[PDB]
Design an enzyme around this catalytic site. Sequence first.
Site, mmCIF file in Angstrom:
data_model
loop_
_atom_site.group_PDB
_atom_site.id
_atom_site.type_symbol
_atom_site.label_atom_id
_atom_site.label_comp_id
_atom_site.label_asym_id
_atom_site.label_seq_id
_atom_site.Cartn_x
_atom_site.Cartn_y
_atom_site.Cartn_z
ATOM 1 N N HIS A 39 0.805 -1.225 0.000
ATOM 2 C CA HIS A 39 0.000 0.000 0.000
ATOM 3 C C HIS A 39 0.847 1.289 0.000
ATOM 4 O O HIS A 39 0.264 2.378 0.075
ATOM 5 C CB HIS A 39 -0.978 -0.006 1.181
ATOM 6 N N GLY A 140 3.965 5.512 9.439
ATOM 7 C CA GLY A 140 5.255 5.183 8.874
ATOM 8 C C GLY A 140 5.913 3.943 9.440
ATOM 9 O O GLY A 140 7.016 3.594 8.998
ATOM 10 N N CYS A 142 4.817 0.858 9.122
ATOM 11 C CA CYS A 142 4.592 -0.316 8.289
ATOM 12 C C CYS A 142 5.885 -0.735 7.604
ATOM 13 O O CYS A 142 6.752 0.087 7.303
ATOM 14 C CB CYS A 142 3.505 -0.044 7.248
HETATM 15 C C1 LIG Z 1 1.597 1.843 8.139
HETATM 16 N N1 LIG Z 1 2.701 2.484 8.320
HETATM 17 C C2 LIG Z 1 0.370 2.161 8.971
HETATM 18 C C3 LIG Z 1 0.574 1.733 10.425
HETATM 19 C C4 LIG Z 1 -0.491 2.295 11.367
HETATM 20 C C5 LIG Z 1 -0.543 3.810 11.504
HETATM 21 C C6 LIG Z 1 -1.164 4.017 12.876
HETATM 22 N N2 LIG Z 1 -0.685 2.848 13.606
HETATM 23 C C7 LIG Z 1 -0.331 1.843 12.806
HETATM 24 O O1 LIG Z 1 0.045 0.718 13.173
HETATM 25 N N3 LIG Z 1 -0.808 1.530 8.407
HETATM 26 C C8 LIG Z 1 -1.789 2.252 7.852
HETATM 27 O O2 LIG Z 1 -1.794 3.482 7.840
HETATM 28 C C9 LIG Z 1 -2.919 1.454 7.213
HETATM 29 C C10 LIG Z 1 -2.941 1.696 5.716
HETATM 30 C C11 LIG Z 1 -4.207 2.462 5.384
HETATM 31 C C12 LIG Z 1 -4.977 2.688 6.672
HETATM 32 N N4 LIG Z 1 -4.223 1.929 7.679
HETATM 33 C C13 LIG Z 1 -4.589 1.671 8.944
HETATM 34 O O3 LIG Z 1 -3.969 0.855 9.615
HETATM 35 C C14 LIG Z 1 -5.806 2.404 9.510
HETATM 36 N N5 LIG Z 1 -6.658 1.514 10.309
HETATM 37 S S1 LIG Z 1 -8.037 0.925 9.703
HETATM 38 C C15 LIG Z 1 -7.638 -0.430 8.661
HETATM 39 O O4 LIG Z 1 -8.794 0.427 10.815
HETATM 40 O O5 LIG Z 1 -8.613 1.955 8.888
HETATM 41 C C16 LIG Z 1 -5.417 3.618 10.374
HETATM 42 C C17 LIG Z 1 -6.680 4.367 10.803
HETATM 43 C C18 LIG Z 1 -4.520 4.583 9.592
HETATM 44 C C19 LIG Z 1 -4.672 3.170 11.635
HETATM 45 C C20 LIG Z 1 -4.007 1.067 4.847
HETATM 46 C C21 LIG Z 1 -4.857 -0.068 5.378
HETATM 47 C C22 LIG Z 1 -3.706 0.930 3.371
#
Ligand SMILES: *C(=N)[C@H](C[C@@H]1CCNC1=O)NC(=O)[C@@H]1[C@@H]2[C@H](CN1C(=O)[C@@H](NS(C)(=O)=O)C(C)(C)C)C2(C)C
Lengths: 299, 289
Positions: A39, A140, A142
């Site tokens: 992603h 960040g 991930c």
């Molecule tokens: C990657 N670096 C992040 C890690 C997250 C950021 C906050 N704490 C974490 O562990 N992952 C994402 O940002 C991930 C990305 C976009 C949305 N997302 C989420 O994990 C979201 N949670 S959700 C699936 O419940 O909407 C959120 C709200 C940003 C934590 C995608 C799934 C592509």
Amino acid sequence: IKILLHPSGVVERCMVSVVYNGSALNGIWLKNVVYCPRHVIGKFRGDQWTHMVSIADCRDFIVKCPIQGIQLNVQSVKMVGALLQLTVHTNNTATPDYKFERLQPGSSMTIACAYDGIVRHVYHVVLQLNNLIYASFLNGACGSVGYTLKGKTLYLHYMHHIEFNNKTHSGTDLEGNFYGPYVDEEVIQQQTAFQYYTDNVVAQLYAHLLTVDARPKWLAQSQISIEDFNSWAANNSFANFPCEQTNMSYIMGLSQTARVPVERILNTIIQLTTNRDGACIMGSYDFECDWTPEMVYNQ
Amino acid sequence: GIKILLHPSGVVERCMVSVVYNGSALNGIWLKNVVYCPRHVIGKFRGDQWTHMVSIADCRDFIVKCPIQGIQLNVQSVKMVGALLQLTVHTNNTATPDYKFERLQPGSSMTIACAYDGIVRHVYHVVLQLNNLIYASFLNGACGSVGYTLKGKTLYLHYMHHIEFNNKTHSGTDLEGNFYGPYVDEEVIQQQTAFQYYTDNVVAQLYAHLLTVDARPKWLAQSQISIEDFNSWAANNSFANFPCEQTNMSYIMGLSQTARVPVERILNTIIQLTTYDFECDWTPEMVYN
Ligand SMILES: *C(=N)[C@H](C[C@@H]1CCNC1=O)NC(=O)[C@@H]1[C@@H]2[C@H](CN1C(=O)[C@@H](NS(C)(=O)=O)C(C)(C)C)C2(C)C
Ligand SMILES: *C(=N)[C@H](C[C@@H]1CCNC1=O)NC(=O)[C@@H]1[C@@H]2[C@H](CN1C(=O)[C@@H](NS(C)(=O)=O)C(C)(C)C)C2(C)C
């Protein structure tokens, strides 16, 4: 005695940062390949990924390995599961003998939580029965990997993808397949009902008997048979005991050291559900699945 | 054509041994100097009885024979690993291949070498279901049979058979001694995980049908459904979220092109068709290759 983490040295030397049109996360660089969550190229759903990755510009992948000071260049991009496999010009000379090992629930791993390609914190986690880890990540993070070490080999188990409002976290193994039914989309996703990994909860009480107090007042007097416990467990969110037949060697060992049969431990678990009343057991006010029988017995 | 493919049993056949103990007769597999067999050959025990009862079992009572090699083996030591017995014998098996003990994730396929008296009698195909059971075929004395796959010269052992449940489900351990699912080797009725369709495999079988039998049958859904819309239906209708395995999308998207039917139509067909049935025996990897 303690929760043991694997030394993060080999993982720190292979971490890299990957930035793509604003989106920035971490990757791991083994041989001439960088593995990172897909992603980074966009927040797509379903089967959009195959096409979007195929039209992704290899020049839009800005990858740098900071502890080695060198900036890499992406030659080809390939999606493998929910990960990207960015083939780069240079072979990582710090690459250890590694193996992609999938975790079964109830096992532990060290999380090397990184930002901008540098490890900032390391902590312990256990894959739960809902196929989530209870970790700690910010934006960040991930691409952070979970790993264990046996002798010389680095055993990679996990790459981070998702945080679910309840402070649970989800990702793939390094083959690119998620743990559980969760996917890398920014939506609410149904969750497995939480269930305790009974083997590990048993290991928590035994660790308490072996280092904090050999005769706590909450330790049950009477025994309950494994079979009677398993009947109660099916209604009280505890997995069937034993969760793993191989844990029985360690659990029988801990019972011999603590001089407390596992029947007393299982009955203590049943009584604690009605009368823990704030007891701090092995340093937690909870039932913890962080203590595996192997880690408690071996140390 | 497109067929259910199985792996050649010859490598397994030359390691199979009979294990007899005080009138109880099972199979075992002989790798290097160790015979792996189910622990209930020594008796019907429950819970934590196993450790002590194994330690008092005299190895002279473990009558182990290799029927294909004409050998009788003498057990020297006994070790219980998980729910399996590790019988160390004096002789090393000259037929031991390069082998690996790999755990199987649900949805994957394997070949069962159904054995009796240490001889492989039948060979058939199973897929581990999401309830962590296989739907196999075993009679008395088949415990010790192995499910396996092969890649090249290596034998990947995945399963050793232990139990048959009332509704013709079968459960066992991996080769490391741990059961698949919450089932154990005890002669009682045990709760089973509710069944759930491994959706990736149901999609693979439908594509296999469009590729060999009838391309465009009349019960194909005329309209597409969203992957996301399907997954909301799936959560209420005993189908696993799609995709079950992210790496299967490569195979499935490839099937969707040559079939010229998008996966969104297959999924909507799955929904309309819901009126062991709609099996999960075809993996996308098998149909595609
Ligand atoms: C990657 N670096 C992040 C890690 C997250 C950021 C906050 N704490 C974490 O562990 N992952 C994402 O940002 C991930 C990305 C976009 C949305 N997302 C989420 O994990 C979201 N949670 S959700 C699936 O419940 O909407 C959120 C709200 C940003 C934590 C995608 C799934 C592509
Ligand atoms: C091992 N050789 C057998 C395989 C069985 C025999 C019938 N079909 C099979 O697959 N396993 C057992 O005999 C196993 C042993 C004893 C009871 N048992 C069962 O499989 C029984 N089923 S159950 C757990 O529901 O009672 C049964 C009724 C014999 C099929 C123990 C679990 C130790």
